[PDB]
Design a protein around this ligand. Structure first.
Ligand SMILES: [Zn+2]
Length: 82
């Protein structure tokens, strides 16, 4: 449910991404990069309520779901590009 293409270069931060989508966290479709399940809006809040970074699976914006959040909370904005 999340396939983001140019010129939507995509950020790494959730509130910023919401800007790209011209919307807010309260609306944004962000899924698990890993589980492909759309995050519960509460979990989507977790992301910006803390200091996590968005993870693009291949090149689409996904958040890190409930399960993955505890796993990948270590990653707080990484420069893994290309
Ligand atoms: Zn997940």
């Amino acid at each position: 449910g999340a396939m983001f293409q140019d010129p939507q270069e995509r950020p790494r931060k959730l509130p910023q991404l919401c800007t790209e989508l011209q919307t807010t966290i309260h609306d944004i479709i962000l899924e698990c990069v890993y589980c492909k399940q759309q995050l519960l809006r509460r979990e989507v809040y977790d992301f910006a309520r803390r200091d996590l970074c968005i993870v693009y699976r291949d090149g689409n914006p996904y958040a890190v779901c409930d399960k993955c959040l505890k796993f990948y909370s270590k990653i707080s904005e990484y420069r893994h590009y290309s």
